[PDB]
Design a protein around this ligand. Structure first.
Ligand SMILES: [Mg+2]
Ligand SMILES: [Mg+2]
Ligand SMILES: [Mg+2]
Ligand SMILES: [Mg+2]
Ligand SMILES: [Mg+2]
Ligand SMILES: [Mg+2]
Ligand SMILES: [Mg+2]
Ligand SMILES: [Mg+2]
Ligand SMILES: [Mg+2]
Ligand SMILES: [Mg+2]
Ligand SMILES: [Mg+2]
Lengths: 116, 149, 77, 134
RNA sequence: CGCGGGGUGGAGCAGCCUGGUAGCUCGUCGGGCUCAUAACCCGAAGGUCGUCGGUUCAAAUCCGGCCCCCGCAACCA
RNA sequence: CGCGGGGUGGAGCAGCCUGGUAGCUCGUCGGGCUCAUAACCCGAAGGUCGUCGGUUCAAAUCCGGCCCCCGCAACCA
RNA sequence: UUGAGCCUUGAUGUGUAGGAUAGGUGGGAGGCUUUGAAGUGUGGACGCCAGUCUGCAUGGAGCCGACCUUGAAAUACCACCCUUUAAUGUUUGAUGUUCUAACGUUGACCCGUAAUCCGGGUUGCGGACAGUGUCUGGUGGGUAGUUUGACUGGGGCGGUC
RNA sequence: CCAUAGGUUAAUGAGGCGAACCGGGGGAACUGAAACAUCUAAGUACCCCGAGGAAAAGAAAUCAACCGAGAUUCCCCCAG
């Protein structure tokens, strides 16, 4: 369990699923819980509620670590992004600061042409 | 093996111990360096009475000469300035060969085998510590200042 | 040749009996290895071409004792 | 865990040693330090399979000095236990008792018992230190 | 001449080795959906198992003759 | 020829190894579903442990066989 | 560092009857406590989070066995041990890094020597790898030794033995 | 550095040939088995090395049998 004092709660909110990984301050992962691994498979996987219950099941699994306060790094458009931070607060954490790490190129690689 | 020692081996021995060591360790290291001699019936007798009384301690005061070897140089500093480049960056990198020549003509008459370089091969212009090995257990800490000539 | 200096071993021959007992001539070679020894007498290195058994012989006997045997056998060492 | 009594019980006796038959019988006076007169139960680990009904060692032997004939049968795991009388019976009396039992077990050898029979025979009193015999 | 396989509802194919009870898809027939057809959904029917005989309690099957089809073979001078 | 094992609703797998107290995933209904079909989602239905003896308070389990599926190494009548 | 066997020692083990996160067995009913007590502060270990385990110490010398509910009695005391597990000792094994002396060097320089061979000597780089011997599994037409039936209205094909 | 390696000179011996025999180092195949692979052919042919007048072996860590014989070599039996 190692008993880490504080950590960072990353939020990967893509269009179809939100993986919420709680790592320490040094990036090393301590636990995770996806919106598709907590039931809600398919159409309901892309909902802000599934994103909520994703972050809920991630609050535990890290109780063994005892992270009191944590920073949050959101990433992606997704359906979550704002419903997942509310549950991550309701779990009993002290939100140090909320940062947005959405990766945006300065017109780098060519995006797909898809979806007609 | 069963090789009886002649010195102060850093892990098992203490001058006069009948330690069992691997055959390769004794044959290639202990034998040719005089750190030990094969424990065969007759050879044991030459050590236990002749050497263990007198010759053993004679090598111990040689280790006292190693204590003398720690301060053969007075100031304990050797400054070498050879051709280099700009912003430090030495032209031709110096080595343990020349440091053996540097301190001998300027203090400690040391050989190349007792010369060390704990930090690279000294390409930089500045402060360096050539930690001499006056003895396996007790060393020297002569500070070498390499200046860009 | 592969003849050891000390033991005087040489490559003997022999059959290679398979599971069907088919005899086939093979050749047993000695475990030669060029090792360099330290003679306390001359205070130098004498390079012999000895087998692995011949090193355990030099281990028991003296190093110079073996060379005394090789000198008696007219070998260059 | 341990205190005043329980530790001295183990300090007197050499734990890492199996004593001779005429040795253990005398040394037991050092251990039985209760108000009453204790007794010594005998621990004999039979080299038979308790997971095999064909090898069950079961019988009764007469104690020469009493407690006094005793009854015995092993566990579902391999060792059998029974007493050989009071601790205050003289040392050579227990000597008479112990030896009588060992014969009694070999007197009841199983046919399918494959392996060393006794391997370790120990006795101890009420408040006794673990003492194995030779 | 020989070797080996096949023949089963209107079509194409399982079942045969290891006998008693034959199934899948399409098509057909009837109903529904639609303004009408196709598609789609629901229900049902439909087979002398090439042909004759024999073995057996019982033969599509196991065995034999004949007819049709398919592949292989039909060679050395 | 042993040495290892593994056998559980229809069925693939648990749980056994370390004694009492059988879960799991598809194959079927009721639905909810929606103008609808699709898909989804909800609750139900089904092995007392392949079979027989011993020990034991209590055997799916531990110990003996039987029928196997195997995993091979063997395999010089 | 990290597996495995073992030693010492310390924990571990809530169908259900239940004051018990009790396994079988078992000798015997006093240990226990002032070689500084019950109760507790508070934290850790353990955890099916039901309840154990426990350091120091304010406190201050008590605490408790058959009794009664169990298929079993009270780790109060002790012995032999089983599943589960902790520290240490020891024992070999498999990895990772470093070291230098074995070994390699178809790197440099010197001498033998006017000689790109070779040997020795300094020195640099590798390094217990590489390579070689014995044993060993796999692969192996690269190579070698061979087998591949008879009857038959000629042999083959088919069929038969 | 010494010292070794190496270099120069002298002395003694060796080198090659030879018919078989002899000891040692390597070592086939056709053939027989009515095929063939274990096996046989055969440790033969042949190649190599070394020596002598002979060579080899040889004075028991041998056999025997609880009685004894006493190195090796060769021949007849033992016995196909
Ligand atoms: Mg595309
Ligand atoms: Mg229509
Ligand atoms: Mg071929
Ligand atoms: Mg042939
Ligand atoms: Mg013919
Ligand atoms: Mg000649
Ligand atoms: Mg033939
Ligand atoms: Mg002559
Ligand atoms: Mg002679
Ligand atoms: Mg002779
Ligand atoms: Mg006699």
């Amino acid at each position: 369990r190692k008993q880490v004092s504080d950590g960072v709660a990353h939020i990967h909110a893509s269009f179809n699923n939100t993986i919420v990984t709680i790592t320490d301050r040094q990036g090393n992962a301590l636990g995770w819980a996806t919106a598709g691994g907590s039931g809600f498979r398919g159409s309901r996987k892309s909902t802000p509620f599934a994103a909520q219950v994703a972050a809920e099941r991630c609050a535990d699994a890290v109780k063994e670590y005892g992270i009191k306060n944590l920073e949050v790094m959101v990433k992606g458009p997704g359906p979550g992004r704002e419903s997942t931070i509310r549950a991550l607060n309701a779990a009993g954490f002290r939100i140090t600061n909320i940062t947005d790490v959405t990766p945006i190129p300065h017109n780098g690689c060519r995006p797909p042409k898809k979806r007609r | 093996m069963q090789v009886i020692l002649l010195d102060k081996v850093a892990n098992l021995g203490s001058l006069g111990d009948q330690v069992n060591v691997k055959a390769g360790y004794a044959r290639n290291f202990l034998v040719p360096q005089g750190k030990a001699v094969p424990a065969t019936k007759k050879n044991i007798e030459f050590f236990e009475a002749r050497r263990a009384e007198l010759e053993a301690k004679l090598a111990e005061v040689l280790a006292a000469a190693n204590a003398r070897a720690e301060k053969i140089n007075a100031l304990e500093t050797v400054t070498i300035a050879s051709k280099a480049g700009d912003e430090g960056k030495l032209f031709g990198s110096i080595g343990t060969r020349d440091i053996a020549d540097a301190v001998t003509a300027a203090g400690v008459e040391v050989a190349k085998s007792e010369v060390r370089l704990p930090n690279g091969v000294l390409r930089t212009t500045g402060e360096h510590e050539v930690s001499f090995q006056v003895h396996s257990e007790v060393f020297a800490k002569v500070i070498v200042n390499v200046v860009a000539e | 040749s592969r003849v050891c200096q000390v033991t005087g071993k040489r490559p003997v021959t022999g059959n290679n009996r398979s599971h069907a007992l088919n005899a086939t001539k093979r050749r047993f070679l000695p475990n030669l290895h060029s090792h360099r020894f330290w003679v306390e007498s001359e205070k130098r290195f004498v390079t012999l071409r000895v087998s692995a058994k011949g090193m355990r012989v030099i281990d028991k006997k003296g190093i110079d004792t073996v060379l005394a045997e090789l000198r008696a056998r007219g070998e260059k060492y | 865990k341990l205190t005043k009594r329980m530790r001295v019980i183990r300090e007197k006796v050499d734990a890492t040693k199996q004593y001779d038959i005429n040795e253990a019988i005398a040394l037991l006076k050092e251990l039985a330090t209760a108000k009453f007169v204790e007794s010594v139960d005998v621990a004999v680990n039979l080299g038979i399979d308790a997971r095999k009904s064909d090898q069950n060692v079961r019988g009764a032997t007469v104690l020469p000095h009493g407690t006094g004939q005793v009854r015995y049968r092993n566990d579902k795991n391999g060792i059998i236990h029974t007493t050989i009388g009071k601790v205050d019976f003289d040392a050579d009396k227990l000597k008479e008792n112990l030896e009588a039992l060992l014969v009694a077990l070999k007197k009841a050898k199983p046919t399918q018992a494959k392996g060393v029979y006794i391997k370790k025979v120990s006795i101890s009193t009420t408040m006794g230190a673990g003492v194995a015999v030779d």
